[PDB]
Design a protein around this ligand. Structure first.
Ligand SMILES: C[C@]12CC[C@@H](O)C[C@@H]1CC[C@@H]1[C@@H]2CC[C@]2(C)[C@@H](C(=O)CO)CC[C@@H]12
Ligand SMILES: C[C@]12CC[C@@H](O)C[C@@H]1CC[C@@H]1[C@@H]2CC[C@]2(C)[C@@H](C(=O)CO)CC[C@@H]12
Ligand SMILES: C[C@]12CC[C@@H](O)C[C@@H]1CC[C@@H]1[C@@H]2CC[C@]2(C)[C@@H](C(=O)CO)CC[C@@H]12
Ligand SMILES: C[C@]12CC[C@@H](O)C[C@@H]1CC[C@@H]1[C@@H]2CC[C@]2(C)[C@@H](C(=O)CO)CC[C@@H]12
Ligand SMILES: C[C@]12CC[C@@H](O)C[C@@H]1CC[C@@H]1[C@@H]2CC[C@]2(C)[C@@H](C(=O)CO)CC[C@@H]12
Ligand SMILES: CC(=O)N[C@@H]1[C@@H](O)[C@H](O)[C@@H](CO)O[C@H]1O
Ligand SMILES: CC(=O)N[C@@H]1[C@@H](O)[C@H](O)[C@@H](CO)O[C@H]1O
Ligand SMILES: CC(=O)N[C@@H]1[C@@H](O)[C@H](O)[C@@H](CO)O[C@H]1O
Ligand SMILES: CC(=O)N[C@@H]1[C@@H](O)[C@H](O)[C@@H](CO)O[C@H]1O
Ligand SMILES: CC(=O)N[C@@H]1[C@@H](O)[C@H](O)[C@@H](CO)O[C@H]1O
Ligand SMILES: *[C@@H]1O[C@H](CO)[C@@H](O)[C@H](O)[C@H]1NC(C)=O
Ligand SMILES: *[C@@H]1O[C@H](CO)[C@@H](O)[C@H](O)[C@H]1NC(C)=O
Ligand SMILES: *[C@@H]1O[C@H](CO)[C@@H](O)[C@H](O)[C@H]1NC(C)=O
Ligand SMILES: *[C@@H]1O[C@H](CO)[C@@H](O)[C@H](O)[C@H]1NC(C)=O
Ligand SMILES: *[C@@H]1O[C@H](CO)[C@@H](O)[C@H](O)[C@H]1NC(C)=O
Ligand SMILES: CCCCCCCCCCCC
Ligand SMILES: CCCCCCCCCCCC
Ligand SMILES: CCCCCCCCCCCC
Ligand SMILES: CCCCCCCCCCCC
Ligand SMILES: CCCCCCCCCCCC
Ligand SMILES: CCCCCC
Ligand SMILES: CCCCCC
Ligand SMILES: CCCCCC
Ligand SMILES: CCCCCC
Ligand SMILES: CCCCCC
Ligand SMILES: CCCCCC
Ligand SMILES: CCCCCC
Lengths: 336, 336, 336, 336, 336
């Protein structure tokens, strides 16, 4: 029996290696296999990965006439001491078990141990949609020991920045992913002490042209369409009135349609500002012709009682586009 | 073996410490890590947190030549007595188990015990949407012993109001969160007796300006647009009629669009009252011109058989806006 | 050890108390804590509650110099005999286990036992939507023994109608809840025999005014708006035609919008009948003016070849509203 | 102890009764309690039922001075041999366990055994939507032994067609259910051999009138409305043009609305054919008036340069309805 | 006892057969039972299948006076050595367990073993929607050993391309499935070594005619409808203006409706290009008439101050359709 080569029954494996002295170093490597989903309303993401640990234990040494190592599956884990890592700020997670538990242990003649397992985790990521669709988000995944302070266990990246590998075809449907890297930082708990924490960081971006074409293009076209009425004969009331009112109706349908297709986040975003400013421009263009028609009617009635282009149209033909151009300059200087 | 330092086999751990005498005090601390989601239709919320217990047991004392404590994981829990806390008014919950059970026990030489675990819970929160979108909601989470009355176990906050800590970046997507605090109260069960209950309270609010801009602004603009027809020449029937009917159509589309984007709660809310009053104003403006056209036609026919601005327009130009202003004053004095 | 006070090893606990003789009575009490959700398309509901059992077993008696009782948690359940209750017509259910199993046992010196546990259950409830939104539904939850017939186990409510308690703040978002009460009935299985079954009954109702304002009000307003054209000068074709066709378009949008917000139940309901009758009225009002215009044109052409209000408008002004009023009387006498 | 009346330790229960000789017959009965849901996009259904087995084993015989039988729960199952049935073509399933496992065993003095359990299963059902909404679907549930060929185990319906019972109130929200019955058939696996398979069959149908009123009625009404323009004076251009274009807009909104309410199945169905043919009719009616207006204008210009009803309207008034009637005859002769 | 015919206690089953020498070959067969679902936003699919292994172990040989084999269920698996296969790039999976674990073992007198189990798996499949709805996708499922390198275990398809069988009625609701086949490839891990990997490949396609009729047909019809105004008398302003503006409104509603029914993928696809080009054509047709009306008005005013078909219409009648035809030629030569 291979488990008799390790004196299992001859040691207390409820205490750590080196108990009573300096802390035992434990080195970590990570391989990311995929990014599974993201939730914008609930603000979290899901990832699948391999986690590997390295440490030394002299109680595990066995004699050999060679330099061959022995390999075990997850049934040995409950018989020896292993590190207790957990994921900070996570909502749910599990270890894969088909067709059997996805756990491996390899033990060297001198007591060096490698511990490997496959896991899926869902973690939180606070997001800010104030600059949507031009926003940028940063997320992280964090790794920590549950019960051992830095005085008993010293956790570190085994090879620095070479300790993280990512799959060549990692991708998300609605985001672009860039800039993977690792960091470390000490954290403090008033109940027990100081602990080491490791981080995995990355950044997300959207596709800007899709949103430009889908939202900003039609609004601008409808605003430009509402200026056509300034060049139409003011005596054609049955053609001036329906045009303005239908233009309002079209802009309202566009805004409702856009609202139905964005994530349900209930506070004010940049695209909303653009859309409602354009709606106000369309409203003002109807008020203009109302004024013109009233004034013309008054003039005609006065002339008959006593017995060309109106100035408002001439000024509006210049003033409306200039003000829209100035709004656009300010908006795009502010939101980049 | 460390479990032989505690005389495990030498005591009955199916009875409480101090059995037969006064109740044993048990002190509680809570650290909230995050707020995961909220459901407005089902009226509940989800939270993730650390729960810590403190008590003393003389049967656990062990000799030491030092003041060092021993630490265990969750396999020891089934061998000793521990408190049986549960969450009142909850729908589902679980304890995290990756990469192993997230449970810790620390035992002092004199028998003081600390018990720590990590848990996620979903709890109910009755809500009232009568003043939507200006409503305010209050929620709570409650903690109680399942089987021990106040005569056997005394449950209390360890440090009063300093016993609750919350994460610095706790947030929800559609709500603002404020005013965390703790309370206690005795409850009575006719089947067994009196029990101590602990509470965690907080308050939620919405973003008012988003809703103002999205709902109240367009309705008011359309009501103001329907008043334009009072200044148009009454002889232009083909321009007066289509304008009113298209204005009705636009207001109906706006109302349907707003209805599709609120949570599906089927009783009457404030915003509904605002919207349907505005719809009635738009309807009345079409009835006005119907009356005017009929009366003008009668007058002309009478004059021809025998062989300026109509008064109704002049009065309507004043009466409609005053009545809308009075409605707005009353509405906003009532709903703040 | 407290489990040695009960002679556990000295009795066969795979047989019932009183085996071989009359049936053992078992009394039941229920406390409802909350109503969690309801599903109209799948026709089921979810509930969370406490279930308590009472019976006597002389094999459990122990000596005492006092009248104190002993309390156990769920680890004792597998060592003694307990009743096997299950929920009839249910789809899924589970027993809460945080922070430990929510099970209690209390044993009196003379062998009286109390058994308590906390459970969540989803059960079916056949529904009829023919009179929507004026429908009423009745639901029930049923409790039965799986393996013991009335000859071996007699199941009954411990205190009659006082055996059911409900929480003071029980509520559902879209329903009103009323009239909780209990009943009993015998059921028969051809495979094994007769069994006792217990019932918990309640009733659900909707908020009628919300639905009135959201659906019936706009339809009636549009039908009334289509009658305006009967008072308009028949020589204004460019004002009579667009009005009818836009009125049809508005009514169609209203009907689509209403259809998108009701539960997806694919058979005919009362509100559908109301809406499609109103649509038919709006269609008929356009056919009327088509007839009037054709006849006027014929008359003018005839008069010119040879070389006031038309009767159809005068009759329509009376006939349309009377017929709508009669439809409303019949409809509301039929559907209450 | 009742388990000592059966010589449990005295037989190898890892082999079947009658090992080494002819196959052992096993008889099956089924009671369906409910139909829980159906998924049209994923093409599956869910059902809840009781499954009962009957067979004889002489190793289970025990002496009795009477004809009373002994009853056990599911803890005995792991100590004796039982049949290994499984559900073919299923996606997921489980056995109910509240408040304990829903399993029963009854053993007669002579070794006759009854085995009963309660189970929920989700199974696939390939569907064809080509004739929607006039389609008919057939589904089945299949039962088979996992490891024993017909040479070792003979599986059959205990009582033929009397072996299946269904609940009196079984129903689905959007379907009608009819024609339950059972069948049997042999299947062949090249890896191991021939096996017996049992079937449960039933049929589903929709409510036709709901779909008629919701879809076919409005389309036909709009097609009939577009024919009104053939009777309108050809000199009223501002009344002929808006009518056709608004009629197109109404038909497009109707089609979009209908599309949003059917199950998302992306291939061509009958109702789509009806709707797009009607759209083409509405398009052609606008092309007609375009032609008429152009020709009239040419004639007038020619007459002035040189210095009644147009035939196209007269022919269209007959030709359009006849062609629609012929389309309807062919369509309804093809799709029933 | 049948487990005493195999000397279970007489061998260490924690090491592989042939330990210390050449690798042991293991042969694999697969039978696909169904394709359960596909997720376009999350980019994955689900499948249910039978997995079978073949290998030889001399420690399992037993004497027989015949050539009969012994069969076991899944309780034997934990007592002997078996291969540890797992699914690469998968998100979740499980082994069916109703009414018992769906596992079988068959052992020949000479030590040949067959191992069979039933499993459901969800795997990732990166997709590209740039050519939607004319796109083609390829997916695969991959099988690998977790802990043994090619030096210890040699994994291969038992019968080459005859090793894969698929069900005759396998289907998906919105896709067509074709071209199943198998491949093999070596993979390299820097932590442990080289491993053998097996692949199952297939291809998916859509139904093109459904999408043609639903999207491309209405857009083209509306573009053709906007050309009607070039043949209408330029003096009929109240008929030329409403027609263009309503045509814009109809096209906008069509585009919103189409957007609401495609999978929510936020980057630019071919159908979007088609739709927005058609929208631009409709916009240009309104700008044309604006120009024509302005120029006519100028001419009339000049003539009066001093005291037929306009050229722009004549050129537009030719130029618009030619340019649309050229766009269509280029588009369909590019996207096939
Ligand atoms: C072309 C369009 C969208 C389509 C019409 O509404 C016109 C605007 C004009 C301003 C443009 C904008 C696209 C996004 C631009 C290029 C901005 C960016 O650098 C984005 O990061 C700055 C100015 C923006
Ligand atoms: C500006 C707007 C919304 C946009 C148009 O409809 C005009 C109203 C006028 C009344 C305003 C309201 C915004 C919300 C106000 C300020 C109310 C509040 O204190 C909210 O708590 C009281 C009066 C309300
Ligand atoms: C006011 C309104 C709805 C709003 C407009 O459509 C007008 C109808 C008129 C008939 C009313 C109905 C509301 C519901 C009533 C009162 C019915 C009920 O007792 C309901 O149980 C009987 C008559 C119904
Ligand atoms: C009344 C209506 C629907 C409502 C308008 O579109 C007119 C058609 C006319 C043809 C009818 C159809 C209803 C369904 C019928 C009766 C068909 C069936 O036997 C159905 O199985 C054959 C002819 C069909
Ligand atoms: C008939 C229709 C759609 C309906 C109207 O928009 C007109 C176009 C004309 C061009 C056609 C297209 C259908 C798809 C075709 C046949 C393309 C394909 O081979 C598809 O793989 C090449 C040319 C395309
Ligand atoms: C670097 C190292 O570990 N080398 C060892 C060597 O010491 C040992 O003698 C040999 C036995 O075959 O195996 C190898
Ligand atoms: C406050 C306290 O517990 N102090 C103890 C002290 O009594 C003990 O002698 C010493 C042994 O090293 O450890 C410390
Ligand atoms: C009603 C009842 O059970 N009374 C008992 C009494 O018989 C017993 O002598 C006493 C011992 O303290 O406890 C109490
Ligand atoms: C049909 C049958 O099984 N009858 C039995 C009978 O043989 C037996 O003597 C009796 C003992 O009470 O129980 C009954
Ligand atoms: C090919 C093969 O395995 N043949 C065997 C034969 O060797 C054996 O003598 C016989 C016993 O009945 O069973 C068969
Ligand atoms: C790892 O590399 C990243 C690359 O951006 C850098 O930011 C970071 O500081 C590096 N960390 C260490 C420990 O070298
Ligand atoms: C805790 O502090 C809160 C702060 O609002 C207060 O309301 C509450 O009464 C305090 N409770 C105790 C026990 O001090
Ligand atoms: C319980 O009370 C309800 C109240 O409605 C009554 O209908 C029922 O008959 C009562 N049952 C018994 C057993 O008293
Ligand atoms: C069972 O009855 C059904 C009723 O339709 C019949 O089709 C079937 O053949 C019958 N089967 C047997 C085995 O009698
Ligand atoms: C299996 O058959 C497929 C059929 O396309 C072929 O592509 C593949 O190369 C074949 N593989 C082997 C190993 O024969
Ligand atoms: C309709 C005309 C829109 C013009 C927009 C100009 C935007 C300029 C942005 C300059 C950023 C530096
Ligand atoms: C269209 C004019 C709306 C005017 C609204 C006035 C609201 C005043 C609220 C005063 C609250 C004290
Ligand atoms: C538009 C007028 C609607 C009138 C509806 C009258 C309904 C009367 C119901 C009487 C029930 C007894
Ligand atoms: C608008 C007129 C529709 C007429 C439809 C007639 C359908 C006849 C079906 C005959 C089936 C035998
Ligand atoms: C409205 C006219 C559309 C004409 C489209 C022609 C497409 C030709 C494609 C040729 C591919 C080789
Ligand atoms: C392809 C980018 C288009 C942007 C139109 C505003
Ligand atoms: C837009 C304001 C114009 C004023 C011209 C007098
Ligand atoms: C709005 C009512 C006006 C009445 C004027 C006589
Ligand atoms: C508040 C009830 C309103 C009903 C309108 C029909
Ligand atoms: C609505 C029918 C009126 C007929 C008058 C002659
Ligand atoms: C619809 C075609 C009519 C042709 C009459 C000459
Ligand atoms: C479309 C441009 C036409 C120009 C004719 C002069």
């Amino acid at each position: 029996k291979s488990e008799q080569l390790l004196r299992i029954d001859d040691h207390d494996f409820s205490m750590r290696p080196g108990f009573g002295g300096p802390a035992i170093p434990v080195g970590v490597d990570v391989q990311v296999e995929s990014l599974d989903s993201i939730s914008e309303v609930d603000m979290d993401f899901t990832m699948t990965l391999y986690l590997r640990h390295y440490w030394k234990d002299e109680r595990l040494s066995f004699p050999s006439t060679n330099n061959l190592s022995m390999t075990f599956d997850g049934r040995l884990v409950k018989k020896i001491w292993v590190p207790d890592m957990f994921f900070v700020h996570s909502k749910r997670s599990f270890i894969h078990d088909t067709t059997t538990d996805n756990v491996m242990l390899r033990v060297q003649p001198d007591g060096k141990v490698l511990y490997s397992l496959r896991v899926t985790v869902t973690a939180m990521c606070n997001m800010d949609f104030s600059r949507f669709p031009l926003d940028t988000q940063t997320c992280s995944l964090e790794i920590e020991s549950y019960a051992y302070t830095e005085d008993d266990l010293m956790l570190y990246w085994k090879k620095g920045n070479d300790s993280l590998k990512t799959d060549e075809r990692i991708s998300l449907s609605q985001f672009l992913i860039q800039e993977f890297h690792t960091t470390t930082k000490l954290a403090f708990y008033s109940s027990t002490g100081w602990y080491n924490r490791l981080y995995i960081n990355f950044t997300l971006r959207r596709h800007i042209f899709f949103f430009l074409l889908q939202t900003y293009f039609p609004a601008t076209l409808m605003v430009m369409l509402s200026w056509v009425s300034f060049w139409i004969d003011r005596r054609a009331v049955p053609a001036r009135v329906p045009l303005g009112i239908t233009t309002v109706l079209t802009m309202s349908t566009i805004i409702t349609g856009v609202n139905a297709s964005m994530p349900r986040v209930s506070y004010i975003k940049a695209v909303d500002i653009y859309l409602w400013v354009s709606f106000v421009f369309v409203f003002l263009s109807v008020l203009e012709y109302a004024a013109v028609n009233y004034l013309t009617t008054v003039q005609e009635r006065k002339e008959q009682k006593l017995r060309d282009t109106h100035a408002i149209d001439k000024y509006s033909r210049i003033i409306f586009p200039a003000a829209y151009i100035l709004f656009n300059l300010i908006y795009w200087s502010i939101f980049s």
